[PDB]
Amino acid sequence: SQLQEMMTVVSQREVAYNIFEMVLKGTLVDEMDLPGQFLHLAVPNGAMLLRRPISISSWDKRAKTCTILYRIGDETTGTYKLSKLESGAKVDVMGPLGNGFPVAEVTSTDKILIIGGGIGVPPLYELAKQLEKTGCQMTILLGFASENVKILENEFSNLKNVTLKIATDDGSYGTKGHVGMLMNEIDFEVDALYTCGAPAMLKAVAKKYDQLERLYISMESRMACGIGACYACVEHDKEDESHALKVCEDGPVFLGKQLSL
C-alpha cells in the first residue's frame, strides 16, 4: 500500500562522475509533498540486508515518478549494484520517510538562501520547485569539489526568481573555493536559510547564521530501520543533556545550531 512498494525504474543514466540519476515510477509518489523526505531502497543482493536512505530530488505528479541522484562506490557497495538496474527493473522501496522542509509556512516577499554541496544538493532541487510556485527571491549557492561532480545546474538556473552561484574547490568551473567564500558576499538580509551538504559545510553555515530562526539543516546518519525503532541514527538535541533526536524520524531536517528540532 502506502509505505513500501516494488517501484519500476523508468530510466537511469550516469549524469556525473559516478553519480547516477534514477527515475522511479509508482503510487508512493502520491504521498509526497514536503521537500527533504527520503526513500529507503533495498539492494538486489541477498547478502546486503540494510536499505540505503536516498533523498528525493524531485517528482512528477501527473507522470507518477520521482527522481533520485546518488553517488556509487566500488564493486562491493550496494549502490554500485543499484546503478546496474535497467528500465523495467523493480526496486523494493520504503518511503516517503522523515520530516521534510517547511515550505507551506512562508511569504511571497522574503529573501531565501539555499546552500548545498555535493550529494546534499539533490533534495534542494524540489525545495526550489516548491518555493517557486509561491514567489520571492532565492539565491542558490551550490558547491562542488570539481566540475566532474557538478550536478543539476541546468534545472536550478532554469528556475524563475532564482539567482545561482557555483563554487568549486579544485576542478574549477565557477567561483573557485568553498561555498563559505560565497556566503561572505551576500548583502541581502535573508529571513530563511535551507541547507544540505557535508558536515563541515553545515558547521560553517550554522556558525555564520548563528541566530537565524528559520535555519533548516538536512542531516545524514548511518541508519538501519529507517523508521525510528532501532535508534541507530541518533543525535543530541539542544546540548548533550537533553532529548535524543533520530535523523530518520525527527529529521532528516532540524532547526538551528549544532542541533535543535
Partner: protein
C-alpha cells in the same frame, strides 16, 4: 489466529510463536503504524535500565555479509519513563498483547531494581534478563560468561520478580552448557538465545573501525547456524523451554528453530530489511506446516523433545 500455531510457555499464552526481538522493535510505537501489532504472539521490547541511557557515540551500525553490526549501547529512557509512558501506551492500545520485558544493567543491584518494579505493569507477562552486559563489579566481565556469577544474578532476580524469568544467553563462550545448567538450577523459568556475536569492520579510507565503539554485536542470517548449534546443544540438557532467535528471516527458519529445540521464535534484524516480516511469516507458517506433516507447533515441540536418545 488458530490452534495449530499456539504455544503456552511460562507466563506466555501465545496466539502464535512469532515475537519481535529486543532492540529491533522499540516499544512497538513505530511499527504499529505499519500493521496491527495484535497479529504478533508477543513483543520483546528494548532493554530497560534503572537509569536512562543515551547509549554509544555514532556510527552505531555497519553492514556485513548477510548480517549487521550494531553498537547502540542499550539506549532507553529509563525505568520511570518506561513504567509511566511506554508500557501504558502498549496496554492502552493493545491490552491483550502480552509483552516480554528485557532487563539490563551494569551490576546486580541494577537488575534487581528493574525486575522488582517492571512486573507491576499489567501488560508485562515475563522478564527477559539480558546477561550479555559487562559486570562493572567483576572488572567488566559479562555476567553471561561465568556460571556462578550468572547463577548468583538469576537467584537474586528470581527472589524479587512477580512474573516468570527468562534468561538470554550469550553465544560468546567456550562452553555454553555449564552456564545453562547453572541458570536453570538458580530458578529460571526458561531461556532465550542467542544474543549477538562480536564483530568489527574497518573503513579502508580512514583505516579506522567503522563503529565509534570499535566492536559491535553481529546479528542476522549470517549467525543462524551458530544459534541453531547452541540451542540444540542446550536443549539436550535443560528442562525449561527456550525461545530461539538469531538470523530468522522466514517461516522456514522458524521451523528450523523448532527442529533444533526452540519452543517459540524471536525475529530481530529481519524487521529492518522488511518491516512486514513477522506478519508474512505468520501467514506462511501453516502452508509450510502442511507441507511438512506438522499438525501443530505444540505437537512438533513434543515430537522433537522425545526424539532424543
Amino acid at each position: 489466529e488458530n490452534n495449530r500455531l499456539s504455544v503456552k510457555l511460562p507466563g506466555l499464552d501465545l496466539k502464535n510463536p512469532i515475537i519481535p526481538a529486543s532492540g529491533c522493535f522499540g516499544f512497538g510505537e513505530e511499527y504499529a503504524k505499519y500493521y496491527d501489532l495484535n497479529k504478533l504472539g508477543s513483543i520483546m521490547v528494548k532493554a530497560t535500565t534503572l537509569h536512562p541511557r543515551f547509549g554509544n557515540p555514532t556510527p552505531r551500525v555497519a553492514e556485513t555479509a548477510s548480517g549487521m553490526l550494531n553498537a547502540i549501547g542499550l539506549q532507553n529512557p529509563g525505568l520511570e519513563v518506561i513504567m509511566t509512558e511506554k508500557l501504558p501506551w502498549l496496554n492502552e492500545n493493545f491490552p491483550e498483547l502480552p509483552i516480554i520485558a528485557n532487563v539490563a544493567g551494569s551490576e546486580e543491584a541494577d537488575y534487581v531494581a528493574v525486575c522488582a518494579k517492571i512486573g507491576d505493569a499489567a501488560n508485562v507477562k515475563a522478564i527477559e534478563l539480558n546477561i550479555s552486559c559487562p559486570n562493572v563489579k567483576h572488572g567488566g566481565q559479562a555476567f553471561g560468561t561465568d556460571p556462578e556469577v550468572a547463577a548468583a544474578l538469576v537467584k537474586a532476580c528470581k527472589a524479587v520478580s512477580k512474573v516468570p524469568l527468562y534468561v538470554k544467553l550469550s553465544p560468546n563462550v567456550t562452553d555454553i552448557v555449564p552456564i545453562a545448567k547453572a541458570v536453570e538450577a538458580a530458578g529460571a523459568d526458561g531461556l532465550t538465545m542467542i544474543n549477538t556475536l562480536m564483530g568489527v569492520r574497518f573503513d579502508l579510507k580512514t583505516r579506522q573501525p567503522i563503529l565509534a565503539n570499535i566492536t559491535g554485536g553481529l546479528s542476522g542470517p549470517a549467525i543462524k547456524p551458530v544459534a541453531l548449534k547452541l540451542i540444540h546443544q542446550v536443549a539436550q540438557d535443560v528442562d525449561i523451554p527456550i525461545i530461539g532467535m538469531g538470523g530468522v528471516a522466514n517461516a522456514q527458519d522458524v521451523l528450523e528453530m523448532y527442529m533444533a529445540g526452540a519452543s517459540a521464535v524471536a525475529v530481530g534484524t529481519a524487521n529492518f530489511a522488511d518491516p512486514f516480516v513477522c506478519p508474512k511469516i505468520i501467514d506462511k507458517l501453516p502452508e509450510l506446516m502442511d507441507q511438512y506433516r506438522i499438525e501443530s507447533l505444540e505437537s512438533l515441540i513434543q515430537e522433537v523433545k522425545e526424539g532424543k536418545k
